[PDB]
From Swiss-Prot, chain B:
Homology family: Belongs to the RNA polymerase beta' chain family.
Function of the molecule: DNA-dependent RNA polymerase catalyzes the transcription of DNA into RNA using the four ribonucleoside triphosphates as substrates.
Record-given protein name: DNA-directed RNA polymerase subunit beta'
Portion of the full-length sequence here: 792 to 904 of 1524
Subunit structure as annotated in this protein's UniProt entry: The RNAP catalytic core consists of 2 alpha, 1 beta, 1 beta' and 1 omega subunit. When a sigma factor is associated with the core the holoenzyme is formed, which can initiate transcription.
Swiss-Prot record, chain D:
Database matches in Gene3D superfamilies: 3.90.940.10
GO BP terms in the entry: DNA-templated transcription
GN (gene name): rpoZ
Family (UniProt): Belongs to the RNA polymerase subunit omega family.
UniProt cross-references to SUPFAM superfamilies, sorted A to Z: RPB6/omega subunit-like
EC numbers: 2.7.7.6
Protein name: DNA-directed RNA polymerase subunit omega
Superkingdom of source: Bacteria
Root EC class: transferase
Keywords (A to Z) from UniProt: DNA-directed RNA polymerase, Nucleotidyltransferase, Transcription, Transferase
Sample GO molecular function, one term: DNA-directed RNA polymerase activity
One Gene Ontology CC term in the entry: DNA-directed RNA polymerase complex
Species classification: Bacteria, Thermotogati, Deinococcota, Deinococci, Thermales
Organism of origin: Thermus aquaticus
Summary of subunit composition and partner proteins: The RNAP catalytic core consists of 2 alpha, 1 beta, 1 beta' and 1 omega subunit. When a sigma factor is associated with the core the holoenzyme is formed, which can initiate transcription.
Statement: the UniProt record of this protein carries the keyword Calcium: no
Swiss-Prot record, chains E, H:
Organismal lineage: Bacteria, Thermotogati, Deinococcota, Deinococci, Thermales
One Gene Ontology cellular component: cytoplasm
The name this protein goes by in its record: DNA-directed RNA polymerase subunit alpha
An example molecular function term from Gene Ontology annotations: protein dimerization activity
Protein source organism: Thermus aquaticus
Assembly information from the UniProt record: Homodimer. The RNAP catalytic core consists of 2 alpha, 1 beta, 1 beta' and 1 omega subunit. When a sigma factor is associated with the core the holoenzyme is formed, which can initiate transcription.
Family the UniProt entry places it in: Belongs to the RNA polymerase alpha chain family.
Ranges for region Alpha N-terminal domain (alpha-NTD): 1-223
Record comment regarding domains: The N-terminal domain is essential for RNAP assembly and basal transcription, whereas the C-terminal domain is involved in interaction with transcriptional regulators and with upstream promoter elements.
Swiss-Prot record, chain G:
Subunit structure: The RNAP catalytic core consists of 2 alpha, 1 beta, 1 beta' and 1 omega subunit. When a sigma factor is associated with the core the holoenzyme is formed, which can initiate transcription.
Name under which the protein is recorded: DNA-directed RNA polymerase subunit beta
Family under the similarity heading: Belongs to the RNA polymerase beta chain family.
Species for this entry: Thermus aquaticus
Function of the molecule: DNA-dependent RNA polymerase catalyzes the transcription of DNA into RNA using the four ribonucleoside triphosphates as substrates.
Length: 98, 113, 56, 93, 227, 146, 97, 227
């Protein structure tokens, strides 16, 4: 959970915002402080090796968020959780010596 | 496949004739590979319950679902009265057939363990 | 030029493949067995196959 | 598992002697474009291809199956290297 | 006796079949093979090529759209379709969505022979003034052939997408002890065949049996060369 | 003809264009080191008639095995605001090339427990050690390195 | 089991095969019905697996279920290479690593 | 698309067959059906319980015979025979041998419509003055039924014997990937088929394809019960 936060690989809400326009480029959240602030997204941008950086908007085009609550995901970060691979069912057995 | 089962279920018993042990296997009193004794001769259930004139016969009986890969049975393999397990015989078969005479092949392999 | 390799050159390649065998090595070279010769088998994919018994 | 391997190794004394023989002969098979060989069209190497099943062009295999018959002669100091190139590169183009 | 054949369906999606009785072990001997041919060789659909007016590549960000381009292709491959016409193996589809509307399979513009079995499959969540235009040229074929393999050449901006054919989702046969028969140790064959609706379980069983018996009839005259 | 496909203006490739290894990206062109063509090559030139032009091809192609699609078009010309190039060099370009790669045959893979491995082939969904519910397994790892 | 007996199914024969094998090995306590045996074999992490190639089951049970795995950096798509005749080190005519 | 089936035999006993090319997994789809049906079906000779004069128990040792009772019962099982007419699915054969005589399968006393295709088989070795009399019941069927399953005594002391039905000894097919031009995704599936005397390697095969295609035609008429 915290891994994606302290790594700053995810973009949360600085305060209790209100998601106005999702826009998979510009995620805007009008904060409770009355000001209107938006955080642009890094969607599909080169990284130091091969794997790009992505911020997948997981927040509906309106609702009131919580301060410190996630808005846009990250490459290995799913729903504010460290997601490396994908959980898969595996049979433990000698399959044709493969 | 080369291993050999021995269950402790049967625990071994003294049976006058093969009939006792015969009905006993279906009665659960004895186990398929359980090391019992008929009269004065010492033998297992399956050791009698399966008599194969030739290996291919055993192959059928086991592959048809009437027997298990590792069980102590009786077969006539390579002009000799044998008593062993199906996988056991299978081994020799594979080797020889991959050589081209099962005779010397089986002759240099341990058919016991 | 390009990736346009037709079957024409596939079979043609196999014509010079059959017979002669290429040497396959695995570092380190400790045992001489770290280098053994095998028959080229044109196969799909990227990685490389080999007999599981000689891999040891 | 090249066919005749056991027999091959068993022919000569060392491994290398064999390799050398196969080598020089396989080369000779190329210099004359296969019209030298002591085998018969049934014995000659057969490569099965979709297009047509020809004789396997691989020289190595040619020499391989070639020695298995024994019709070939080898060993050091066989004949003078001189006349060996006069009556070899002549008989075949 | 005779093979009492039963078939218990549900809709174009779920379906069951039963062949009872049968010889011991026979049920396994028959049930799995048809299953095997079924999950694979069953002819199918589910897109080919997708285009959007604002997109130059699968990585492009369309304004007014929460989902990324390929992110939508996730929903497009999973999309189920059926052409009512056997002659139509290729046509075209259209889509238009403006304003804050939820783009789903149903929003597609209907045409001749085209049929979507899942109108509720989410395509993209659109915000205010988010406009979207889409055209998928959906063709029929068999198996699984990713975009990399099949070319498209519809236009400079139109891109191939992976194709998941075979309307069959999953299949599970079953062997059990049946009471219908003379002797004992008999088999009651059961089938769990699942389908997206493009092809009903009945259709799947039918044509699979066709491809099966067909490839099976290749056994007529061999050429014997004895040593 | 075709080798010039997405070059549309300044010798750059349009965004979202597949460059298979062996294709190009940019258009670099400089005067070749001028050297009299070999005799056979001189006659070879006269025959066909394409002259040996002052400038020869330079332009940067794409590596053998990185097939992508163009995304970042980044040009930096000498003489533009907020860009200082090397002392006596003209316009440069850094193009981005992205490619989608599915799990390939032989690609390294490991679990959280430190068990390395490379994908050995694949396996048809058809043939799989499934369960009574008709759900086929997706990987199947041997109990050796346990 | 609810999605089995409820959905209109029952104990499979192949299941019986495996269960019996386990009842011989001890993986499942004897005297217990297949409902209990396949259960004990289930909590063992194992189950009754068939063969999608054949359809016959497996003599023994095989554990399964979800696991977290990952595709590591190194990919043959990059590393794999072979050349014929390329450039050479200016000094000595050796090739280039 | 046009899989060539070619088959090379040896005698009426052993034979091999290949269907090349074929789609990946198809060959495997063929192998098990053909296998289980070949070994669990295919009507054949199959001798059941035998009677012997002066001998009762399956163990008691018959004098003037080098081999004991069971040892002979094995050679009785290895014997193959066939009915000239489909109407006689069960017969009985008899044998009587005295003195120092070498008994073979051919040495058996013949019957009405019955033909022993296995003329030379050591049945039993007779010693000096060795007296013997026997009666064998040969019935037709399929699969494998040991002494336990089939009870039979047609005599005072009759000894039930394993029934060897399927003339087939073993099969164990094999698939593999062969190449074609460009594509290597094909199957070279091969099958090794053994048979004793009853049916030639081809006959067993064809008969198996019959049993298969037969069962495949059982899917015709559904019986609808929807949930």
């Amino acid at each position: 959970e915290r891994v994606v936060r302290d790594s700053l690989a995810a973009l949360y809400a600085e305060e209790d915002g209100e998601v106005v326009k999702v826009d998979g480029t510009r995620i805007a959240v009008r904060y409770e402080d009355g000001r209107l602030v938006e955080h642009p997204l890094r969607r599909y941008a080169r990284s130091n090796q091969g794997t790009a950086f992505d911020q997948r908007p997981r927040v509906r085009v309106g609702q009131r968020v919580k301060k410190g609550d996630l808005l846009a995901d990250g490459p290995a970060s799913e729903e504010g959780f460290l997601a490396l691979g994908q959980n898969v069912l595996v049979a433990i057995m000698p399959f044709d010596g493969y | 496949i080369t291993q050999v089962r021995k269950e402790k279920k049967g625990a071994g018993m003294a049976f006058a004739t093969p009939e006792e042990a015969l009905a006993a296997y279906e009665r659960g009193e004895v186990a398929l590979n359980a090391p019992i004794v008929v009269a004065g001769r010492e033998t297992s259930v399956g050791r009698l319950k399966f008599v194969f004139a030739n290996p291919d016969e055993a192959l059928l009986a086991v592959a048809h679902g009437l027997l298990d890969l590792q069980d102590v049975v009786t077969v006539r393999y390579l002009g000799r009265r044998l008593e062993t397990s199906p996988g056991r015989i299978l081994f020799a078969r594979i080797v020889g057939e991959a050589v081209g005479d099962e005779k010397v092949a089986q002759e240099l392999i341990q058919m016991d363990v | 030029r390009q990736r346009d390799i037709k079957d024409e050159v596939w079979d043609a390649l196999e014509e010079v493949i059959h017979g002669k065998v290429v040497l396959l090595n695995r570092a380190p070279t400790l045992h001489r067995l770290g280098i053994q010769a095998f028959q080229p088998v044109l196969v799909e994919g990227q990685s490389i196959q080999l007999h599981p018994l000689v891999c040891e | 598992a090249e066919p005749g391997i056991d027999k091959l190794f068993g022919m000569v004394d060392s491994k290398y002697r064999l390799t050398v023989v196969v080598a020089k002969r396989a080369q000779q098979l190329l210099r004359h474009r296969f019209k030298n060989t002591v085998l018969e069209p049934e014995e000659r190497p057969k490569m099965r291809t979709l297009e047509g099943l020809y004789d396997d062009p691989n020289a190595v295999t040619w020499a391989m199956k070639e020695l298995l018959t024994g019709r070939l002669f080898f060993g050091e100091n066989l004949v003078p290297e001189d006349r060996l190139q006069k009556e070899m590169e002549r008989l075949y183009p | 006796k005779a093979p009492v054949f039963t078939a218990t369906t549900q809709g174009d999606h779920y379906g069951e079949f039963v062949l009872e009785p049968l010889e011991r072990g026979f049920g396994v001997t028959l049930g799995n093979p048809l299953r095997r041919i079924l999950l694979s060789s069953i002819p199918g659909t589910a897109v080919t090529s997708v285009y959007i007016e604002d997109v130059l590549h699968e990585f492009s960000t369309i304004p007014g759209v929460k989902e990324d381009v390929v992110e939508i292709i996730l929903n497009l491959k999973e999309l189920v379709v059926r052409f009512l016409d056997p002659k139509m193996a290729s046509t075209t589809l259209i889509l238009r969505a403006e304003g804050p509307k939820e783009v789903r399979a149903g929003d597609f513009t209907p045409s001749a022979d085209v049929e979507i079995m899942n109108p509720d499959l989410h395509i993209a969540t659109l915000e205010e003034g988010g406009k979207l235009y889409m055209e998928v040229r959906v063709d029929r074929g068999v198996g699984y052939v990713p975009a990399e393999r099949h070319g498209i050449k519809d236009r400079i901006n139109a891109i191939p997408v992976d194709a998941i054919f075979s309307p069959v989702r999953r299949v599970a046969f079953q062997v059990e002890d049946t009471r219908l028969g003379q002797r004992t140790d008999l088999d009651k064959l059961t089938l769990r065949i699942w389908t997206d609706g493009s092809v009903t379980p009945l259709e799947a069983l039918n044509q699979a049996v066709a491809i099966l018996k067909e490839h099976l009839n290749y056994f007529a005259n061999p050429e014997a060369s004895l040593l | 003809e075709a080798a010039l496909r997405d070059l549309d203006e300044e010798g750059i490739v349009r965004i979202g264009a597949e460059v298979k290894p062996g294709d190009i990206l940019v258009g670099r062109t400089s005067f070749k080191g001028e050297q009299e063509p070999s005799p056979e090559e001189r006659l070879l030139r006269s025959i066909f008639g394409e002259k040996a032009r002052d400038v020869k091809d330079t332009s940067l192609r794409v590596p053998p095995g990185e097939g992508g699609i163009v995304v970042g078009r980044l040009r930096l010309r000498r003489g533009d605001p907020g860009v200082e190039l090397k002392p006596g060099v003209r316009e440069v370009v850094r193009v981005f090339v992205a490619q989608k790669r599915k799990l390939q045959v032989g690609d390294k893979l490991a679990n959280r427990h430190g068990n390395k491995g490379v994908v050995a082939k694949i396996l048809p969904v058809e043939d799989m050690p499934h369960l009574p519910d008709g759900t086929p397994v997706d990987v199947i790892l041997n109990p050796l390195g346990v | 089991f609810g999605k089995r007996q409820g959905e209109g199914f029952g104990v499979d024969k192949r299941e019986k095969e495996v269960l019996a094998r386990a009842e011989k090995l001890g993986l499942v306590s004897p005297g217990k019905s297949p409902e209990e045996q396949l259960k004990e074999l289930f909590d063992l992490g194992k189950v009754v697996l068939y063969d999608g190639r054949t359809g016959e089951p497996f003599e023994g049970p095989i554990v399964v279920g979800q696991m977290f795995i990952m595709k590591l950096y190194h990919m043959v798509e990059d590393k794999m290479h072979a050349r014929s005749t390329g450039p050479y080190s200016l000094i000595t005519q050796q090739p280039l690593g």
